[PDB]
Amino acid sequence: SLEQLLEMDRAHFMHPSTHAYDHASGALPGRIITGGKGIRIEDHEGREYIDAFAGLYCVNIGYGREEVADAIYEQAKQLAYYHTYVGHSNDPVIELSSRIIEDWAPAGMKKVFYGMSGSDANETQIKLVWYYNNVLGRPNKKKIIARERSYHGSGIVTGSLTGLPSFHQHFDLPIDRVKHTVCPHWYNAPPGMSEAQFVAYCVEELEKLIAREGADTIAAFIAEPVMGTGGIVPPPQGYWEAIQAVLRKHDILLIADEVVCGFGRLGSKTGSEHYGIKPDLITVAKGLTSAYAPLSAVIVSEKVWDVIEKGSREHGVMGHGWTYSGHPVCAAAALANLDILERENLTGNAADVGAYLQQRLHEAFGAHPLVGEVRGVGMLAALEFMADKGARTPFDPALKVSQKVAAAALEDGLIVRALPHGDILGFAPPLVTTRAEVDEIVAIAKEAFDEVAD
């Protein structure tokens, strides 16, 4: 019974990112998702929704892929699990590793280490950067620079990297080794710069942080090529070239968080490829498997892998491992996911239909007095709402405009996300989305928005 389900939920399930009391008490009503196909999902009540956020930037090949379910089945049946400790392996993990390196990763990458979450992958990154510096005799080169409004996960170290305050509240974060520099959102500049001027500003602010802390104390800089949860923010043109030069000058490792941007989302293999970023380390999850099974990976450059090898010769086996590291079923899911991305050229579809999404959002919302900015890249897009446009001046957060539009859209059968920063409505549809589906998405969001606007 659906009613006893919902009581069991309220009584016993602690959800992620859900108001504990309001949920437990019934004030925040629960929604049970039971099926889905293509870009549409279905709740327990039989209501169907267009999921223009692809779960959480992650159901990239779309819902209901029997091909992946069969791949998962066949592996679960043959060998669901053995460990990968002390050189042990399984077939799928071997194939997946060489495929990630040969076909998806930028040049210079060498090794892949697996977990199950974006958060655990970034945890691994910070371990590796500390290990690297310790084996090189640099015990104080340990601080990590992240950015305001960044999202890097929800643990203690990874929640510190995260530049959104909700992940810090009552958790004593950020930790002391994590420092935050500026969010590269041109729309929000010092308030009259050229794009190039704003880049130079971001560069000087980073240079100031480095000077205050001391370059010899900074191990790494971590960043999303395009900001996701912080509010769908492409980098300014020239940003990545200029930031990379600063990091190289100060011998600071670069970690590209590709959890959202990875595996076709922007119309390129990765955000790194898209923007000419040459990271030392890369974090992936989400579109790695299109969420069909949980899997994360850390991709390691030749340079860093060489120091890891060196560490092992001098100090023996590195103490790092998860029980389910390289889980056969999860690896098999990833292989089928990649087969589908590649065969259907969904990276191309993301570029193509993603540009159409940008176009249609601009046409629909660009001229409107309450829309401060329309922005995006590939199959990511956002609308940022402003009380005055003009003066670039945001609504009283108590008004909750982004949230009211999202709610209205949901009533009309469309899922889009109110992002945690400001009044921002985000779009991250599956990479299989068609032009017609975009027009359908935009029509509903447009109606929703007018209803709230009035």
Ligand X SMILES: *Cc1c(COP(=O)(O)O)cnc(C)c1O
257 binds, among its own copies, ligand X, Ca ion, none (CB under 5 to 8 A by kind): ligand X
Of 362-421, binders to its own copies (CB under 8 A) are: none
Interatomic CA distance for residues 9 and 26, integer angstroms: 10
Residues 59, 429 contacting (CB under 8 angstroms) = no
Q: How far apart are the first and last CA of the chain?
A: 40
What is the torsional sign of CA 379, 385, 391, 396?
Answer: negative
Peptide bond between residue 234 and the one before it cis (omega within 30 degrees of 0) = no
Tokens of 68: 């992946």
Binding partner of residue 229 among ligand X, its own copies, Ca ion, none, CB cut-off 5 to 8 Å per kind: ligand X
Smallest distance from Ca ion to CB 402, Å: 16
Closest residue by Cα to residue 267 from 330, 354, 327, 148: 354
Which residues lie below 8 Å from residue 275, measured CB to CB, with a gap of 6+?
A: 225, 235, 240
Q: Report the nearest approach of Ca ion to the CB of residue 63 (Å).
A: 15
Q: Which does 180 bind (CB under 5 to 8 A by kind): ligand X, its own copies, Ca ion, none?
A: none
CA distances from 249 to 129, 357, 453 (A): 18, 39, 49
Q: At residue 111, what are phi and psi to the nearest 5 degrees? A: -120, 155
Q: Which of these, 75, 94, 23, 58, lies nearest to 431 by C-alpha position?
A: 58
**What amino acid occupies position 399?**
L
The answer for 361, left when phi > 0, alpha when psi is -120 to 50, beta otherwise, is alpha
CB of 197 vs its own copies, minimal distance in Å: 34
Question: With CB cut-offs between 5 and 8 Å by kind, which of Ca ion, its own copies, ligand X, none does residue 88 bind?
Answer: its own copies
How far apart CA 231 and CA 426 sit, in angstroms, is 7
Residue 421 has which token pair?
């920063």
163 or 311: CB nearest ligand X:
163
Q: Does 89 bind its own copies (CB under 8 A)?
A: yes
Could you say which of ligand X, its own copies, Ca ion, none residue 28 binds, taking C-beta under 5 to 8 angstroms by partner kind?
its own copies
Query: What is the rounded CA–CA span in Å between residue 211 and residue 133?
Result: 19
60 forms part of the interface with ligand X (CB under 6 A): no
**Binding of ligand X at residue 257 (CB under 6 A)?**
yes
Residues 250-289, mask of contacts with its own copies (x by CB under 8 A) = -----------------------------------xx---
Per CB under 8 A, the segment of 155-163, 356-364, 372-380, 424-432 that binds its own copies is 155-163
Q: Which does 412 bind (CB under 5 to 8 A by kind): Ca ion, its own copies, ligand X, none?
A: Ca ion
| Distance in Å, CB of 121 to ligand X, minimum | 8
Which residues are at the interface with Ca ion (CB under 5 A)? Answer: 66, 70, 412, 447
Of its own copies, Ca ion, ligand X, none, which one sits near residue 447, judging by CB under 5 to 8 A according to partner kind? Ca ion
- In one-letter notation, the amino acid at residue 409 is A
User: Would you put residue 33 in left (φ > 0), alpha (ψ -120 to 50) or beta?
Assistant: beta
Instruction: Determine, following the binding rule CB under 8 A, whether residue 15 of this chain makes contact with its own copies.
Output: yes
Q: How far apart are CA 326 and CA 246, in angstroms?
A: 35
Which amino acid is residue 50, in one-letter code?
I
Number of residues that bind its own copies (CB under 8 A): 126
**φ/ψ (deg, to 5) at 188:** -110, 20
Cβ nearer to its own copies, comparing 203 with 415: 415
Nearest distance in Å: CB 287, its own copies: 11
Q: Cα(150)–Cα(256) distance, rounded to whole angstroms?
A: 12
For ligand X, the closer CB: 154 or 359:
154
Site membership for ligand X, residue 228 (CB under 6 A): yes
> CB of 18: closest distance to ligand X in angstroms?
14
The CB density around residue 201, as the number of other CB atoms within 10 Å, is: 17
What gap in Å lies between CA 317 and CA 311, rounded to an integer?
8
3-state secondary structure of 375: strand
d(CA 199, CA 6): 50
167 binds ligand X (CB under 6 A): no
Of the two residues 298 and 442, which places its CB atom closer to its own copies in the complex? 298
Assess 17 for contact with its own copies (CB under 8 A).
yes
| Closest by CA position to 342, among listed 61, 5, 46 | 61
Nearer to ligand X, 153 or 372 (CB): 153
Using CB under 6 A as the binding rule, the residues of this chain from 259 to 278 that contact ligand X are 259-260
281 lies in the binding site for ligand X (CB under 6 A) = no
Contact letters for its own copies, residues 325-364 (x by CB under 8 A): xxx-xx----------------------------------
Q: Which of residues 285-314 bind ligand X (CB under 6 A)?
A: 285
CB of 349 to its own copies, least distance (A): 21
From the list 32-40, 124-132, 147-155, 237-245, the region that binds ligand X by CB under 6 A is: 147-155
Q: Which residues bind ligand X (CB under 6 A)?
A: 117-119, 151-153, 224, 228-229, 257, 259-260, 285, 322-324
